[PDB]
């Protein structure tokens, strides 16, 4: 892994940062 994966999951837990997904 979990390189990106536990932090991907932080951005997508919307504060409006991941390429848009929830």
Contact predicate 12/3, CB 8 Å: no
Contact predicate 11/17, CB 8 Å: yes
Q: Residue 11: enclosing H or E segment and its boundaries?
A: helix 5-11
Work out whether the CA dihedral 16, 18, 19, 22 comes out positive or negative.
Answer: negative
């Amino acid at each position: 892994x979990s390189l990106e994966q536990e932090w991907a999951k932080i951005e997508c837990e919307v504060y409006g940062k991941c390429p848009p997904k929830k």
